[PDB]
Amino acid sequence: MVLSEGEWQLVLHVWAKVEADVAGHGQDIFIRLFKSHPETLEKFDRFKHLKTEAEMKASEDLKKHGVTVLTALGAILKKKGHHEAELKPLAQSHATKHKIPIKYLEFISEAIIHVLHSRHPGNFGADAQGAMNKALELFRKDIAAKYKELGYQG
Ligand code: HEM
């Protein structure tokens, strides 16, 4: 699949807002993910002990992790589709070291959309959300293709 320049512009416009506070967006996204799909928390040995949202918000390590994840996702989005190089190491670590099913990538994509919708309604209308969903589906499609090449079905 391919996004038009117009769709990329909608994606990058709202992402520019996210970049005004990466750490804050990272926390909301992971808390949303862990609360909506608790099973995903079991994949993080470093955070699986967190019991409440209060504990999650207070975790310095979780906040730092969120910045690392969003920064990588941002680098990929800014390539506007030409992200083959950025995807390689990401796909290998998540398929071989962390063992993350495509299903879980769908869950975090939902968390991202939810948080952007909550925080940036003025820059995340129907068209912009459609553009973001398309960019995330492209991301998941390409990561899935790499998973297969690497020998991981998940
Ligand atoms: C938006 C998609 C995602 C991106 C861009 C992303 C990015 C990253 C990055 C950059 C790291 C650190 C470097 C590395 O280990 O490769 C990381 C670590 C990790 N990711 Fe992801 N990730 C994504 C989705 C997920 C999902 C959905 C899970 C599973 C619920 C997951 C589980 C992990 C784990 C377990 C680690 C190691 C954390 C640690 O022990 O420090 N990731 N991810």
Structural domains of the chain in order of their starting residue, each with its CATH number: 1-154 (1.10.490.10)
Number of C-beta neighbours around residue 38 at 10 A: 9
Helix axes 84-92, 60-77, angle to 10 degrees: 140
Q: How far apart are the first and last CA of the chain?
A: 21
Cβ neighbours of residue 91 closer than 8 Å, sequence gap 6 or more: 143, 146, 147, 150
Q: How was this structure determined?
A: X-ray
In the annotated binding site for O2, the residues are 65
> In angstroms, what CA-CA distances link 154 with 91, 100, 106?
12, 7, 12
Q: Whose CA is nearest to atom 22 of ligand 1?
A: 69
Would you state the structure tokens that stand for residue 44, as one six-digit string?
């993080």
Torsion of CA 16, 18, 21, 26, to 10 degrees: -150
Locate the ligand 1 atom nearest the alpha carbon of residue 40 and give its number: 30
Instruction: Report CA(43)–ligand 1 centroid distance (Å).
Output: 10
77/127 Cα distance (integer angstroms): 17
135/129 Cα distance (integer angstroms): 10
Number of C-beta neighbours around residue 149 at 10 A: 11
